[PDB]
Amino acid sequence: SMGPGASDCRIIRVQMELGEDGSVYKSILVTSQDKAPSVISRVLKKNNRDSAVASEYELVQLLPGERELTIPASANVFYAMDGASHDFLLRQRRRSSTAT
């Protein structure tokens, strides 16, 4: 398409397991090459955290049929996300270390 608003970035909503504090849903910017671990770092610091290694968490996209599409590390969220919902979440991942 054509139009003056040719910008290539967008903003998504991201929750966390906070519970009491309510659904975070913070406005997180998404660039053309924003990979999962880059976006996670922004979400973590938006949660008033001492924001930690993104490798300890995983990026998740919410889908309208009550499903979850988990975005892997080497995928640009901007293209990895299905694009059916601008809503996402972040959760601590339990998976091991740097064994070669």
β-pairing, 57-63 vs 67-71, is antiparallel
Phi then psi for residue 62, to 5 deg, are: -90, 140
Give, in order, the Cα–Cα distances in Å from 97 to each of 17, 49, 55: 23, 22, 9
- In order of start, what are the domains of the chain with their CATH numbers? 10-92 (3.10.20.90)
Nearest to 69 by CA among 52, 89, 41, 53: 89
Kindly give, in sequence order, each residue whose CB lies less than 8 Å from that of residue 27, ignoring residues fewer than 6 positions away.
11, 12, 13
Name the experimental technique: NMR
- Segment holding 14, helix H or strand E: strand 10-15
Q: Partners of 90 in the beta sheet?
A: 59
Nearest to 87 by CA among 66, 75, 46, 50: 66
Q: Are 49 and 41 spatial neighbours (Cβ–Cβ below 8 Å)? A: no
**Buried/exposed 64-80: b ≥16 CB within 10 Å, e otherwise:** eeeeeeebeeeebbbeb
